Design a protein around this nucleic acid. Structure first.
Ligand SMILES: [Mg+2]
Ligand SMILES: [Mg+2]
Ligand SMILES: [Mg+2]
Ligand SMILES: [Mg+2]
Ligand SMILES: [Mg+2]
Ligand SMILES: [Mg+2]
Lengths: 42, 54, 88, 95, 114, 274, 52
RNA sequence: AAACUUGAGUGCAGAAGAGGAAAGUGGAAUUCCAUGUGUAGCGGUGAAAUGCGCAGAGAUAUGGAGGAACACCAGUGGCGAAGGCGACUUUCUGGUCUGUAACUGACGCUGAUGUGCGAAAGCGUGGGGAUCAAACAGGAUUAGAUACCCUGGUAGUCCACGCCGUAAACGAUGAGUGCUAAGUGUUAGGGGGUUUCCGCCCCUUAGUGCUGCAGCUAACGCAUUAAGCACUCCGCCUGGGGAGUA
C-alpha cells in the first residue's frame, strides 16, 4: 500500500494519504472477496 | 392440399414421442405446410384425438 | 366489407354505360356502402382503432373523388348528392 | 352460403335410445333458421387421448351445415354447455 | 400390498427427497437428506442420494413392497444417483419416468438473481 | 349504478346516491305488507337500551320468506322492488300455483325468470335447495342455520358464502366474514349472490340523510363529564388517560374479545374471522 | 415414460439419460429459474438461432 | 378548350398473415382450501438464519375453487402507420401482395394550423386479486448500508370506463418517385421447362436478411431495404454550460 503527497502542510497532506490508502485497501479486498461464486460440482 | 384435422395417422407422425411438435428443421416440411399443420394439430389436441403430453 | 352480390348490385344504378366500373360516381357509391358498413361495425365496437384508419383513409379517397368530380362537371356532382345522401 | 362442420362428443356410459334421443334434438337445432344439414356422420367409440371428466371413451359425431346466418350453431353452443352429457363441441367454417 | 408400488424422487437444487408408496399412492415410507444428519448444502450431492434412497426403501417393512418402478420429479444433481443407489437395496427398478412439472407458460416466475 | 351530485350546495357537495335501475316497479304489493312501528332503542320497560335510534322515515314491513318451502313448483319473477328494511332488494316471485311472495333478489335476476325451491332443483341463481344437494365450490346465500327455521346467514346486499366441503351430516362453508363454519346438511341455501352490490358505496353526504335513516347523533365519550362516561372530563381536551379505551358502561372496548365461550357452536367454528 | 426391462439398471439409465436430453425438461426448467425480461429472450432466442 | 395512357384508383381471379374488436372453449403449471395415507423436518444460501411444522408440515394421491399467462410449433419468420401483436373456435372488420387486362382518365405527391392513435409507470371511478413485486418488516454478509442475498409483504401487475401523451418511442437515419456491378439465404405469389410419382432448375414481382464494386463519408462505415446520383414538400440545427430551467 503506497501513496505520496507533494504538499507542504504535513497535517493536510495526510488527509489525502489516508484517502489514497483507504481506496487501495478496497481494491485489495474486492479482488479477494469474489470467493462467492456459485459453482456446483458435477 | 390441405391438412384435415381428423386425419390422425398422417398428423401423428408429426407429433413428438411425448406429445410436442417436431420443428420443420428436423421433419423437413416447407414453411406454409408447417403452419397449416399447426392449426390442425392444435384443433386435434382440443378434441382429444392427440394428447398434450403423454 | 360487403358481399360481391351487394357490391355488384350497387354498381348497377350509378353505372354510366355497361362495363364501365371504375367511373368516379360508381366508385363513390361503393365507398358510401363501405363507409356506412364499417362505422356500424365501429358503433358497437368502439375500441377497434386499427379498423378506424381504414375508415378514415377511405373517407379521404371519397373526398378526393368528390373534389375531382366538381372540377370537370358540376351538374353530375349535384345529382350524386341527391341520389345518395351526403352533406356539402 | 357458409359451410360449417360441428363435432360434438357424448358420454360413454349411456345406453342406446338415450344416445339417439340427444342427437335428434340437435339436428333439429342445427336445422333451425334455415340451416339444412348436408349429412350427419357418426364415428364409433374412440379411445380418446386423455381424461376429460374422468372418462376413457367417447362417441363422436360429424354434422355438416350449410347456413348463412350463424343462428343455428351458436344456439348449439348455448345448449351443449348446459347439458351434462355432451362433453365437448367445436364448430369450424370450411371455405 | 406385497411387491407392488411407486417410488417418487424429486431432487431439487437442494435436499434430495424420496417417498416410496404403493401403486395407488398412499405414502408407504419416506426419507430425506436432512434425516441423515446433512444439515445444509451437503444435501445437494449425489452422495446424499447414495444413502437417502435405501433408508426409506429398506425401512419400509410393513408389506414387503419390493418393486418400485421409480418416478423422477425434479431437476437435481443427485437425480440418476438415487436410482443407481436403489439397486444397492436391489428392488427391481422396472419403469423409470421423468414426470416433472413443465408449464405451458402459465405463471410469472420470480426475479433474476444478481 | 350510482349517480354523483353536482356541488350546488355544501350539503349536497360530496354526496353520492344510488340510481334505482334494477328496480322495475316502484309500488309495494298490497297483500304482503304489514305495519312496522319504530321501537327507537327502547325495550318493553320503556327505557332506551340501545343508543342512537330515533325517528327516521315511516316504513312498512314486507313479509318475505327466508324459509323456502314450496317444493317443485315454479315461480316466475314479476318485479324487483325496493325494501327500506334491508340492504338488499326484494323480488316478487309468483308461483304457477298462483301464490305471490317475496324473496331477496340475487345479483343476476331478471323478470320472467323461473325459480325452483326444492331438492330436485337445478343449480341456478335464485333456486333454493338443501346443502346436501348443493355441490361443493358454488357460492350460495340465505343460509338456514337450523332446518326449517329459515335463512339467516349471508343475507345483506352483496353477501355470499362458498361451500367448502362435506363432513358426515355437516357441510363446510366460508362466510363473507372469512369464518369457516360447519352448517347442518339438511338446511336450505339459495344459489348465488344477493344483489344491490353498490349499497356500500353511497356517500350519504349530509347530517340529515343519516337522520332520515333513523340514526340519532352519537356524542363522543371524551366530551362528557366523569359520571356519563369513563373518558369524562379533564381540563381542556384530554387523552383517554386509562390503559385502554372503554365503553360507556366500563368495559374495555378496543381489542378485547367478548364471545361468550363454553358454547355449543364452539365445536362447529373451524376458522376464525379474516 | 419409457419402460426398460430384460437388462440391468446400468443400461436402463443409458436409455433414460438420452430420453431426457431429447426432451424439453432440463433445458426448460433451467430457462424458467428466473423471470427474464420480455425483450431479452427475443435476443436470447436470436443468439440460440444465429449460432445454430 | 380537347386527346391519351404508364402514375393513381376501381373491377375480375387467386393467395398469405401473432392486423384489430367482441363472445365462447380448452390443457399443463402456480397458489389456497377440503380429504385419504404417512413421519420428522421442510425451505433457503458462498455459508447460515429469519420463516414453516407434532393443532400432522413438506412429500404423495384424488377432488374443488380462483386468477394469470399460453410450453412444443417458434425462424436474422409473419402482420401493422407506429406503439405493437403468440392457446383454440365463431361472428364483425381493416390493410398489403400477385396475376389479368375490362374500366375511370392526372383523379397525384407532400402537408403548417388542426384532428386522432401512442410501450411501460402513473391518476380517477368501480371490480378482481393467482404468481410476481416498489414501499415496508425481519435474518445474514461487509470494513461500513438504505445496496447485493434470503423469508414475508402493500400499492401495482389483471379487467371495464374515462384520463395522462411521455421512452435509447432507435434503422439514434421524414415522406414520395426515378435511376445506378453483382453474389447469396429466406417469406408470399406468378409464368415456364423437365417431370417429380408434389421434387428440383431457370426467369420475373413484392417483402425480409447477410456479403460487396462504383460512388459517398471526417473516419467507422453505407452500399437497389444508400448514408450513391437527382427532383418536390415538410420537421429541425447553427459553440459548451446556464436549461428543456425562469
Ligand atoms: Mg350507534
Ligand atoms: Mg357533503
Ligand atoms: Mg360523535
Ligand atoms: Mg364538558
Ligand atoms: Mg368512572
Ligand atoms: Mg380521562
Amino acid at each position: 500500500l503506497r501513496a505520496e503527497e507533494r504538499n507542504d502542510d504535513l497535517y493536510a497532506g495526510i488527509d489525502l494519504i489516508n484517502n489514497k490508502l483507504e481506496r487501495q485497501v478496497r481494491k485489495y479486498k474486492t479482488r479477494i472477496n469474489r470467493k462467492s461464486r456459485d459453482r456446483g460440482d458435477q | 392440399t390441405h391438412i384435415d384435422y381428423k386425419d390422425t395417422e398422417l398428423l401423428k407422425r408429426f407429433i413428438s414421442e411425448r406429445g410436442k411438435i417436431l420443428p420443420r428443421r428436423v421433419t423437413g416440411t416447407s414453411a406454409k405446410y408447417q403452419r397449416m399443420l399447426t392449426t390442425a394439430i392444435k384443433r386435434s389436441r382440443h378434441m382429444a384425438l392427440l394428447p398434450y403430453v403423454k | 366489407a360487403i358481399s360481391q352480390e351487394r357490391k355488384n348490385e350497387i354498381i348497377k344504378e350509378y353505372r354510366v354505360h355497361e362495363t364501365d366500373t371504375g367511373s368516379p360516381e360508381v366508385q363513390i357509391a361503393v365507398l358510401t356502402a363501405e363507409i356506412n358498413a364499417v362505422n356500424e361495425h365501429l358503433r358497437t365496437h368502439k375500441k377497434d382503432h386499427h379498423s378506424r384508419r381504414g375508415l378514415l383513409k377511405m373517407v379521404g379517397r371519397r373526398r378526393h373523388l368528390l373534389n375531382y368530380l366538381r372540377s370537370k362537371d358540376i351538374q353530375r356532382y349535384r345529382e350524386l348528392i341527391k341520389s345518395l345522401g351526403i352533406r356539402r | 352460403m357458409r359451410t360449417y362442420e360441428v363435432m360434438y362428443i357424448v358420454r360413454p356410459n349411456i345406453e342406446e335410445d338415450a344416445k339417439k334421443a340427444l342427437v335428434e334434438r340437435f339436428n333439429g337445432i342445427l336445422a333451425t333458421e334455415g340451416a339444412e344439414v348436408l349429412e350427419a356422420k357418426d364415428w364409433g367409440k374412440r379411445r380418446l387421448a386423455y381424461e376429460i371428466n374422468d372418462f376413457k371413451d367417447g362417441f363422436y359425431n360429424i354434422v355438416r351445415v350449410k347456413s348463412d346466418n350463424n343462428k343455428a350453431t351458436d344456439e348449439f353452443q348455448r345448449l351443449a354447455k348446459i347439458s351434462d352429457d355432451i362433453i365437448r363441441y367445436m364448430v369450424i367454417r370450411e371455405d | 400390498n406385497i411387491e407392488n408400488g411407486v417410488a417418487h424422487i424429486r431432487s431439487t437444487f437442494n435436499n434430495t427427497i424420496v417417498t416410496i408408496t404403493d401403486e395407488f399412492g398412499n405414502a408407504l415410507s419416506w426419507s430425506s437428506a436432512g434425516a441423515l444428519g446433512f444439515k445444509g448444502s451437503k444435501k445437494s450431492t449425489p452422495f446424499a442420494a447414495q444413502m437417502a434412497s435405501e433408508t426409506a426403501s429398506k425401512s419400509a417393512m410393513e408389506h414387503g413392497l419390493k418393486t418400485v418402478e421409480v418416478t423422477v420429479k425434479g431437476p437435481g444433481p443427485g437425480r440418476e444417483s438415487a436410482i443407481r443407489a436403489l439397486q444397492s437395496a436391489g428392488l427391481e427398478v422396472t419403469a423409470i419416468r421423468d414426470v416433472t412439472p413443465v408449464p405451458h407458460n402459465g405463471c410469472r416466475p420470480p426475479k433474476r438473481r444478481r | 349504478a350510482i349517480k354523483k351530485y353536482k356541488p350546488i350546495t355544501n350539503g349536497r357537495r360530496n354526496m353520492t346516491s344510488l340510481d334505482f335501475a334494477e328496480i322495475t316497479k316502484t309500488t309495494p304489493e298490497k297483500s304482503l305488507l304489514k305495519p312496522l312501528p319504530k321501537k327507537a332503542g327502547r325495550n318493553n320497560q320503556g327505557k332506551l337500551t340501545v343508543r342512537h335510534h330515533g325517528g327516521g322515515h315511516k316504513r312498512q314491513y314486507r313479509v318475505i320468506d327466508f324459509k323456502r318451502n314450496k317444493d317443485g313448483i315454479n315461480a316466475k319473477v314479476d318485479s324487483i322492488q325496493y325494501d327500506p328494511n334491508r340492504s338488499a332488494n326484494i323480488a316478487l316471485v309468483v308461483y304457477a300455483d298462483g301464490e305471490k311472495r317475496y324473496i331477496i333478489a340475487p345479483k343476476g335476476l331478471e323478470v320472467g325468470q323461473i325459480v325452483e325451491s326444492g331438492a330436485e332443483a337445478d343449480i341456478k341463481v335464485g333456486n333454493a335447495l338443501p346443502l346436501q344437494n348443493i355441490p361443493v365450490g358454488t357460492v350460495v346465500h340465505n343460509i338456514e342455520l337450523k332446518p326449517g327455521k329459515g335463512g339467516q346467514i349471508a343475507r345483506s346486499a352483496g353477501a355470499s358464502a362458498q361451500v367448502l366441503g362435506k363432513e358426515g351430516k355437516y357441510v363446510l362453508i366460508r362466510l363473507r366474514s372469512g369464518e369457516v363454519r360447519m352448517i347442518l346438511s339438511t338446511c336450505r341455501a339459495t344459489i348465488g349472490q344477493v344483489g344491490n352490490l353498490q349499497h356500500e358505496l353511497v356517500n350519504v353526504g349530509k347530517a340529515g340523510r343519516s337522520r332520515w335513516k333513523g340514526i340519532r347523533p352519537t356524542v363522543r365519550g371524551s366530551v362528557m363529564n366523569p359520571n356519563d362516561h369513563p373518558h369524562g372530563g379533564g381540563e381542556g381536551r384530554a387523552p383517554i388517560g386509562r390503559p385502554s379505551p372503554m365503553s360507556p358502561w366500563g368495559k374495555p372496548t378496543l381489542g378485547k374479545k367478548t364471545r361468550r365461550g363454553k358454547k355449543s357452536s364452539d365445536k362447529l367454528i373451524v376458522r376464525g374471522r379474516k | 415414460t419409457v419402460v426398460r426391462k430384460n437388462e440391468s439398471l446400468e443400461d436402463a439409465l443409458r436409455r433414460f439419460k438420452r430420453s431426457v436430453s431429447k426432451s424439453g425438461t432440463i433445458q426448460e426448467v433451467r430457462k424458467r429459474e428466473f423471470y427474464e425480461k420480455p425483450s431479452v429472450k427475443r435476443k436470447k432466442k436470436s443468439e440460440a438461432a444465429r449460432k445454430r
